[PDB]
Amino acid sequence: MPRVLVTGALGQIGTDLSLALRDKFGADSVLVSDVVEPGAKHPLAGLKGVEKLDCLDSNGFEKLVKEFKPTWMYHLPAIMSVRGEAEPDLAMDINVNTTRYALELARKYNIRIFIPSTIAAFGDKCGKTMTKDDTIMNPSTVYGVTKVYTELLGTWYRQKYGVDFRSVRLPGIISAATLPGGGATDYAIHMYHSALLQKKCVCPVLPYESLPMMYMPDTLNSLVKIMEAPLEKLTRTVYNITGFSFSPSELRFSIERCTDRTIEVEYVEGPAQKIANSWPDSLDDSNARNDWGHQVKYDIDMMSEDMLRQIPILHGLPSL
Amino acid sequence: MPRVLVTGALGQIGTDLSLALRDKFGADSVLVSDVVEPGAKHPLAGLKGVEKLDCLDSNGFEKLVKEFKPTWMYHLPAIMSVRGEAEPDLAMDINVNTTRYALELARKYNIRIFIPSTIAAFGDKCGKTMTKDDTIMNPSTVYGVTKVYTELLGTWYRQKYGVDFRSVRLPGIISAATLPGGGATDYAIHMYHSALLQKKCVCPVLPYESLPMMYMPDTLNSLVKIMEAPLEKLTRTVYNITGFSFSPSELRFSIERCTDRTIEVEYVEGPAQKIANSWPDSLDDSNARNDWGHQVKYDIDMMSEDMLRQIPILHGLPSL
Ligand SMILES: NC(=O)c1ccc[n+]([C@@H]2O[C@H](COP(=O)([O-])OP(=O)(O)OC[C@H]3O[C@@H](n4cnc5c(N)ncnc54)[C@H](O)[C@@H]3O)[C@@H](O)[C@H]2O)c1
Numbered sequence: 001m002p003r004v005l006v007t008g009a010l011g012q013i014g015t016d017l018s019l020a021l022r023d024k025f026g027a028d029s030v031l032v033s034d035v036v037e038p039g040a041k042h043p044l045a046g047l048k049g050v051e052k053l054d055c056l057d058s059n060g061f062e063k064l065v066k067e068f069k070p071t072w073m074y075h076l077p078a079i080m081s082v083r084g085e086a087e088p089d090l091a092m093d094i095n096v097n098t099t100r101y102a103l104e105l106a107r108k109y110n111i112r113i114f115i116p117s118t119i120a121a122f123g124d125k126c127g128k129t130m131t132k133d134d135t136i137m138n139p140s141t142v143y144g145v146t147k148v149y150t151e152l153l154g155t156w157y158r159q160k161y162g163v164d165f166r167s168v169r170l171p172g173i174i175s176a177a178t179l180p181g182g183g184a185t186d187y188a189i190h191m192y193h194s195a196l197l198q199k200k201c202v203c204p205v206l207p208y209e210s211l212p213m214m215y216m217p218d219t220l221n222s223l224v225k226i227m228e229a230p231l232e233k234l235t236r237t238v239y240n241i242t243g244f245s246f247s248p249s250e251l252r253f254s255i256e257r258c259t260d261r262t263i264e265v266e267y268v269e270g271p272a273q274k275i276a277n278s279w280p281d282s283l284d285d286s287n288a289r290n291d292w293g294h295q296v297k298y299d300i301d302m303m304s305e306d307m308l309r310q311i312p313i314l315h316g317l318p319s320l
Numbered sequence: 321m322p323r324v325l326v327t328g329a330l331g332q333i334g335t336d337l338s339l340a341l342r343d344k345f346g347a348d349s350v351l352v353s354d355v356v357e358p359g360a361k362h363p364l365a366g367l368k369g370v371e372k373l374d375c376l377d378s379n380g381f382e383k384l385v386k387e388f389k390p391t392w393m394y395h396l397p398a399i400m401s402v403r404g405e406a407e408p409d410l411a412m413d414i415n416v417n418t419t420r421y422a423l424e425l426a427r428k429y430n431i432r433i434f435i436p437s438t439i440a441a442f443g444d445k446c447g448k449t450m451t452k453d454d455t456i457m458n459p460s461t462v463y464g465v466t467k468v469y470t471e472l473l474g475t476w477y478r479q480k481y482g483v484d485f486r487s488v489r490l491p492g493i494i495s496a497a498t499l500p501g502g503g504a505t506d507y508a509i510h511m512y513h514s515a516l517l518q519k520k521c522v523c524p525v526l527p528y529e530s531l532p533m534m535y536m537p538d539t540l541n542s543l544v545k546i547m548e549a550p551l552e553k554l555t556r557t558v559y560n561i562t563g564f565s566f567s568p569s570e571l572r573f574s575i576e577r578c579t580d581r582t583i584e585v586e587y588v589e590g591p592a593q594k595i596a597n598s599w600p601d602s603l604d605d606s607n608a609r610n611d612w613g614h615q616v617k618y619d620i621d622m623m624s625e626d627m628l629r630q631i632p633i634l635h636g637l638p639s640l
Pocket residue numbers: 007008009010011012013014033034035036053054055056075076077078079080094098116117118119169170171172173174185
């Protein structure tokens with residue numbers, strides 16, 4: 001049974017993943033860290049086993065790893081697409097340097113290490129329909145460039161030092177806890193909020209732009225399941241995984257089915273569009289399904305039902 | 321005509337490139353720099369416009385650029401395959417951080433920037449026969465991993481900021497001016513020295529491991545030609561270029577044809593072999609030929625003739 005360290009643990013994936021790990025292996029077997037502390041309304045507030053760690057401080061990062069003695073690490077901090085184009089130096093620092101430090105610690109302390117990649121690692125030469133695990137990688141964002149380096153450097157640590165590096169290329173991840181903002185796939189949560197508030201939604205992604213997506217509970221299952229797999233079953237270090245693909249118009253139809261009313265949406269291109277257009281429409285995740293049993297239990301309508309129930313509970317929006 | 325800065329200029333490529341640029345454009349229009357000073361017998365010793373610059377010193381790098389106002393830059397420092405496997409922190413520092421600084425300067429000060437890539441950017445999934453410009457990139461060395469990042473990051477600067485970033489994936493480069501080191505393709509240069517000294521060459525690459533190679537004068541022609549090209553003629557930022565491929569067995573025969581005598585070579589596998597085996601056997605350089613006129617004058621026997629005449633003259637080895 002593992003002892004799990006999570007870094008950048010207070011963000012979108014880390015919050016839900018931290019809780020799930022605590023449930024499965026026990027709070028004493030999990031250490032949750034982030035450069036920031038949790039808000040008083042954050043789900044990890046007041047919990048034991050939550051610490052403050054700037055992963056750019058390699059000495060502090062090592063200090064924490066020595067003290068806790070993890071056998072597994074999920075290294076989550078990154079600056080993602082939209083922010084990274086505006087603040088590329090910060091993206092290069094965080095996405096390259098924290099990763100280098102993590103991998104050096106995984107070597108030194110014999111840690112099985114997960115670092116997520118992303119469909120943003122692909123660009124317009126990838127083959128946009130059912131994109132393969134091995135293909136041409138020509139990302140159009142600095143974030144994506146940094147994640148190609150993440151994939152290749154992690155794989156080198158495996159080959160050279162036997163570090164047990166594992167990764168998936170995550171699609172857009174949807175969850176109810178997330179505050180709608182300007183992220184590349186934030187149109188989807190904005191749309192759920194608008195529907196609940198019965199207000200006009202102005203969507204920055206074009207209506208028929210399809211992307212690979214996944215609902216959070218499926219994401220968490222896979223993130224645990226890949227780390228549990230015996231090494232001998234893994235034929236590669238980096239796997240595509242997907243939930244289902246959808247466009248904004250499809251998400252709108254889903255919401256209208258689950259609310260039984262019309263939501264008003266106007267499509268006005270924002271910064272997310274050019275980024276999303278350079279990404280695949282759908283992924284081939286057959287290697288993940290075959291090697292370690294990646295599976296998906298939600299479809300778009302199940303997800304919409306759950307979201308429309310969870311958002312009022314979490315954020316105080318009007319319910320259906 | 322241009323004002324050309326060379327960084328990392330005292331090495332194998334830089335020594336001959338610096339002299340060619342001075343000849344072509346005039347000594348007052350070329351500034352060359354390196355972390356170390358030239359020794360008294362270095363071809364660049366005693367020359368004006370040769371300076372000491374550590375490209376990890378970003379303030380120093382900036383100061384030099386702001387003073388000289390280059391219109392072109394050739395950014396040459398890197399830690400290469402064999403050394404990088406043994407000193408990976410140095411390789412990651414030099415290969416990533418100096419590049420990051422050079423690209424930012426190119427953006428800020430409007431410089432046309434060349435940063436060489438390499439066949440080492442490819443690995444065992446590339447398609448090893450007549451490898452294309454766009455393929456799967458899975459390098460097996462940290463150096464190669466850093467060069468993929470170099471290509472993608474330079475290409476992103478071109479896309480995001482309009483930086484005129486140009487690159488070729490260099491094959492193994494053979495030249496006489498520089499004494500050979502412990503690097504992968506430098507077996508070839510050692511084999512010429514051993515032949516002239518009439519002593520045993522112990523070769524760490526297996527006798528039929530074919531690699532893309534090029535003789536320096538053709539390399540110099542192409543390094544200048546790609547930088548002279550009008551931007552509108554370039555359909556891509558990174559080009560494969562090759563001279564010809566050969567194995568150590570082939571080179572030995574070529575040397576023996578020229579020297580009219582046996583030379584003694586023993587093949588004792590070293591680290592270079594597994595690295596070379598993961599590289600292409602030959603490249604497709606059609607895009608370079610088409611777009612900007614890459615061309616090649618030398619074949620293996622013309623190269624061997626010239627190497628065997630030049631080495632005695634430049635280094636005092638036993639003639640003919
Ligand atoms: N959410 C998605 O749709 C998605 C999709 C694909 C891949 N990913 C990847 O998943 C990982 C997590 O994404 P997320 O959506 O949770 O991001 P997020 O922005 O919600 O969370 C990131 C967390 O990293 C922390 N952090 C930043 N700098 C740090 C540092 N110096 N030291 C320690 N922590 C630091 C931030 O405080 C934040 O809590 C990232 O690698 C991301 O690229 C996410």
